Structure 1
Amino acid sequence: TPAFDKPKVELHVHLDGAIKPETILYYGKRRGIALPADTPEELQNIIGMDKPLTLPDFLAKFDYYMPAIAGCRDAIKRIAYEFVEMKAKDGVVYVEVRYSPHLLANSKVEPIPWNQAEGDLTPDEVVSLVNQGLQEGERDFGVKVRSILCCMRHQPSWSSEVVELCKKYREQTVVAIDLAGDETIEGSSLFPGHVQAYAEAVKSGVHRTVHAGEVGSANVVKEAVDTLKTERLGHGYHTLEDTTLYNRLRQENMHFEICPWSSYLTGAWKPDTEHAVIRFKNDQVNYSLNTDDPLIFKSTLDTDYQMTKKDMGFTEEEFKRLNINAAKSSFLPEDEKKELLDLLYKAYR
Structure 2
Amino acid sequence: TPAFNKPKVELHVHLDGAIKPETILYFGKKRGIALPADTVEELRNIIGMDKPLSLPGFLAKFDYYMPVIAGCREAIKRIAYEFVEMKAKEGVVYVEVRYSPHLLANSKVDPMPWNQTEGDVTPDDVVDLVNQGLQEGEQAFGIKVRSILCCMRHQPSWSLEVLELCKKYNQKTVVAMDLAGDETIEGSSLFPGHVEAYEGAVKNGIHRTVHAGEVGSPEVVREAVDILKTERVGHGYHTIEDEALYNRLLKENMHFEVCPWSSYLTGAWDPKTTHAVVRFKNDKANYSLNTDAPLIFKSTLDTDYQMTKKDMGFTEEEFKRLNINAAKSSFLPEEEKKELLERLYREYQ
Into which bin does the TM-score normalised by the smaller protein fall?
over 0.9
- Sort the Cα spacing of 1:236 and 1:54 in 2 relative to 1 into closer, same or farther, 3 A: closer
Q: Quote the Cα distance in structure 2 between the aligned partners of 1:108 and 1:231.
A: 30
Q: Any unmatched runs of 5+ in structure 2?
A: none
* AA of the residue aligned to 2:269: W
Q: Quote the Cα distance in structure 2 between the aligned partners of 1:61 and 1:9.
A: 26
| SS, match of residue 262 in structure 1 | helix
- Sort the Cα spacing of 1:58 and 1:336 in 2 relative to 1 into closer, same or farther, 3 A: same
| SS, match of residue 205 in structure 1 | coil
| SS, match of residue 224 in structure 1 | helix
Residue by residue over 1:292-344, the C-alpha shift from the partner in whole angstroms, topping out at 9 and shown as x without a partner, is 00000001100000000011111000000000000000000001001100000
How far apart are residue 114 of structure 1 and its match?
1.3
- Sort the Cα spacing of 1:113 and 1:288 in 2 relative to 1 into closer, same or farther, 3 A: same
Structure 1 partner of 2:44: 44
Q: Quote the Cα distance in structure 1 between the aligned partners of 2:182 and 2:348.
A: 38
* AA of the residue aligned to 1:66: M
Structure 1 partner of 2:149: 149
Structure 1 partner of 2:184: 184
How far apart are residue 54 of structure 1 and its match?
4.1
Structure 2 partner of 1:323: 323
Q: Quote the Cα distance in structure 1 between the aligned partners of 2:207 and 2:60.
A: 31
Structure 2 partner of 1:295: 295
Structure 2 partner of 1:68: 68
Structure 1 partner of 2:169: 169
2:137 matched to 1:137?
yes
In the alignment, is the contact (CA less than 8 A) between 2:56 and 2:182 conserved in 1? no
- Sort the Cα spacing of 1:56 and 1:210 in 2 relative to 1 into closer, same or farther, 3 A: closer
TM-score by length of 1: 0.99
Q: Quote the Cα distance in structure 1 between the aligned partners of 2:318 and 2:187.
A: 37
Q: Quote the Cα distance in structure 2 between the aligned partners of 1:56 and 1:286.
A: 28
In the alignment, is the contact (CA less than 8 A) between 2:183 and 2:212 conserved in 1? yes
* AA of the residue aligned to 1:121: V
| SS, match of residue 151 in structure 1 | strand
Q: Quote the Cα distance in structure 2 between the aligned partners of 1:336 and 1:240.
A: 33
* AA of the residue aligned to 1:344: L
Q: Quote the Cα distance in structure 1 between the aligned partners of 2:57 and 2:282.
A: 35
| SS, match of residue 250 in structure 2 | helix
Structure 2 partner of 1:29: 29
Structure 2 partner of 1:17: 17
Structure 2 partner of 1:342: 342
Residue by residue over 1:223-266, the C-alpha shift from the partner in whole angstroms, topping out at 9 and shown as x without a partner, is 00000000000001110011110010010000000000001111
2:6 matched to 1:6?
yes
* AA of the residue aligned to 2:91: G
How far apart are residue 62 of structure 1 and its match?
1.2
2:120 matched to 1:89?
no
| SS, match of residue 4 in structure 2 | coil
* AA of the residue aligned to 1:314: F
Structure 1 partner of 2:105: 105
Residue by residue over 1:133-170, the C-alpha shift from the partner in whole angstroms, topping out at 9 and shown as x without a partner, is 00000011111000000000000000000000000000
| SS, match of residue 65 in structure 2 | helix
2:143 matched to 1:120?
no
How far apart are residue 42 of structure 1 and its match?
1.1
Structure 1 partner of 2:194: 194
How far apart are residue 56 of structure 1 and its match?
4.5
- Sort the Cα spacing of 1:56 and 1:280 in 2 relative to 1 into closer, same or farther, 3 A: closer
Identify which range, 162-171 or 179-188, moves more after superposition. Answer: 179-188
Runs of 4+ in 1 over 6 A off after TM superposition: none
How far apart are residue 272 of structure 1 and its match?
1.2
Matched length = 349
Structure 2 partner of 1:158: 158
In the alignment, is the contact (CA less than 8 A) between 2:93 and 2:143 conserved in 1? yes
The CA RMSD measured in Å over matched residues stands at 0.8
2:259 matched to 1:274?
no
Q: Quote the Cα distance in structure 1 between the aligned partners of 2:10 and 2:307.
A: 16
Q: Quote the Cα distance in structure 2 between the aligned partners of 1:65 and 1:149.
A: 20
How far apart are residue 55 of structure 1 and its match?
4.5
How far apart are residue 34 of structure 1 and its match?
1.4
How far apart are residue 118 of structure 1 and its match?
2.0
Residue by residue over 1:65-117, the C-alpha shift from the partner in whole angstroms, topping out at 9 and shown as x without a partner, is 00110000010000000000000011000000000000000110000101222
* AA of the residue aligned to 1:166: C
* AA of the residue aligned to 2:253: N
- Sort the Cα spacing of 1:55 and 1:314 in 2 relative to 1 into closer, same or farther, 3 A: closer
Seq. identity, %: 85
Structure 1 partner of 2:212: 212
* AA of the residue aligned to 1:327: A
In the alignment, is the contact (CA less than 8 A) between 2:11 and 2:95 conserved in 1? yes
Q: Quote the Cα distance in structure 2 between the aligned partners of 1:11 and 1:248.
A: 23
